[PDB]
Amino acid sequence: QSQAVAPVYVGGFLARYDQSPDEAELLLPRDVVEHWLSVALPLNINHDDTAVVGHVAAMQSVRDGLFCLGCVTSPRFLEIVRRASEKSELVSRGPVSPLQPDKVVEFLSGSYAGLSLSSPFKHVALCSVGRRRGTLAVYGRDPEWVTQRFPDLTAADRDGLRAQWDPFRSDSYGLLGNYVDALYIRERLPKLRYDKQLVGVTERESYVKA
Amino acid sequence: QSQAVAPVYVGGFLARYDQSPDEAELLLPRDVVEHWLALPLNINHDDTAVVGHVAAMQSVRDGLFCLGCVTSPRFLEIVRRASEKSELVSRGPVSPLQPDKVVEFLSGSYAGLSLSSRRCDTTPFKHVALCSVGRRRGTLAVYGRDPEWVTQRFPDLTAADRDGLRAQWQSGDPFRSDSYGLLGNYVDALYIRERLPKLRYDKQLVGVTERESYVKA
Known part of the structure; x- marks a missing residue:
């Protein structure tokens, strides 16, 4: 069990x-950002400030x-998610070809298949x-494994991040x-099955379930 | 708390x-059903999670039409609490109907029926x-508080149909x-490929419009 929490x-x-x-409102041109960029802006479930599970490792x-990395830590939330994936035929099916099962990651990758900002920068x-x-x-055990999941990304902005990273x-x-x-949420798959094409990411090489 | 559970x-x-x-393997014709004709009512086919039983097969x-009944003090308890923390459950039902957290959460989380039977290549009707x-x-x-009320939601259902159904339905928590x-x-x-769409079809089909019940699709 230890290799889950x-x-x-x-x-x-x-x-x-x-x-x-x-x-x-959501509109968000680079124009602000650089300027817009201290505190410990956290990572929560759909915004609920009583469902936080860690921090926004780093942005850039x-x-x-705009791209960011988080780090689900809540030794309680992870604990729920684990036994949750206990009974999830999507989770029991597993990832793809070479990837290895990671119950806790696969679950999070499927129930919360996307990020959403809110803002300095609220959370x-x-x-x-x-x-x-x-x-x-894009969930993962290793932050860089994650970073290289997005074709776009150069080496710099990647090492930009790499020089950064129970509520x-x-x-x-x-x-x-x-x-x-x-x-x-009406046709959630499209908006989703669109985003994985937008940044390259696919089920063939990542845990993305979309 | 008592009105809910x-x-x-x-x-x-x-x-x-x-x-x-x-x-x-999903082919299930009249003469088969008729031939085959208290089955348990569980969630997502989970043999461990049985919230009640079926009261009518017609x-x-x-x-093939059936009327069920969620009776589990434990399951109805989990549901009650989860409707509190739902956004859809606080928004409310369709204008003339009265709010019913439990029936809403349930009517949104488990919006479909799925029978278990033998492979139609004394219990052919598993659950x-x-x-x-x-x-x-x-x-x-269609989930309700009154078993009659849930039938009246199906246009196709006749009176002679509801009657035959009535005669039927009239270890503690499973x-x-x-x-x-x-x-x-x-x-x-x-x-599930086309979940909300598959449902909207089911509605307009069986006739159970939403502006006269609890469905969410």
Whole structure:
């Protein structure tokens, strides 16, 4: 069991420039960011400030939007997620060809398949889809394994990050309650099955379930 | 707390005769059903998680119809708490209907029926399962507080149909799971191809519009 309640790294885009944000406010041009960039802005479930599970390791805008890495730590949340994946036929099926099963990672990769910003910079959030477009969450045990999952990324902005990287007041009832709300986010797969094409990431080489 | 964790009812078609299954092993015709004709009512086919039982099996004109009943003090307890922390459950039902957290959460989390039977190559009818979407089409799951109320939601259902159904339905808590057990199930649903769309079809099909019930699709 011990190789499950160990940190989980999640990485991805919080904004996508070359993507006209069809929605309101969410619009977010590089223009602010650099300027916009101390505190310990945390990582929570769909924003609930009583469901935090770690920190936003580090951020750093690059040629194609804003990118960040988190680090799920909540020795309680991870503990729920584990026994959760205990009974999830998606989890029991496993990852692809060469990748190795990681129950705790696969679950998080599937229930919260995307990141969502909120802002200096309030916080980052794991959710079932992203407000913006192309903010697919990529989970992993190793942060760099994660980083190289996104074709775009050069070496620099990668080593930019590499020169950077139990707050859980919730429960199975919290998680049970957020899931119903997500089961109705209209055609969640598209917005999702779109984001993995937007940044390259695919099921052939990552845990992304989308 | 007591108004909530009271017995809950669920009705709906298990199979539609005038529909072609999307896979041969799903073929379940009239004369078969009729031939075959207290089955347990579990969640997502989980043999450990049995929240109640089926109260009626009725082969009507359009297909195999059944009315269930969630009775587990443990399962209805988990559900009650989870509807509190839901965004959809606080938004409320359709204007004329009264709020019912338990029936809503349930009517959104397990919006489909899925029967268990032998391979249609004294118990051919294994059980009935609540799950996020049925495999066979037209299996919306209308959950109610009144078993009559759940039938009246199906246009196709005749009076003579509801009667034959009434005569039927008129170790303590069966649950053998817990909340974390129910957890890993919602993921699995989030990846059923065309979940919300498959449901919307089931609604307009069986007739159970939403502006007259609790469905969420």
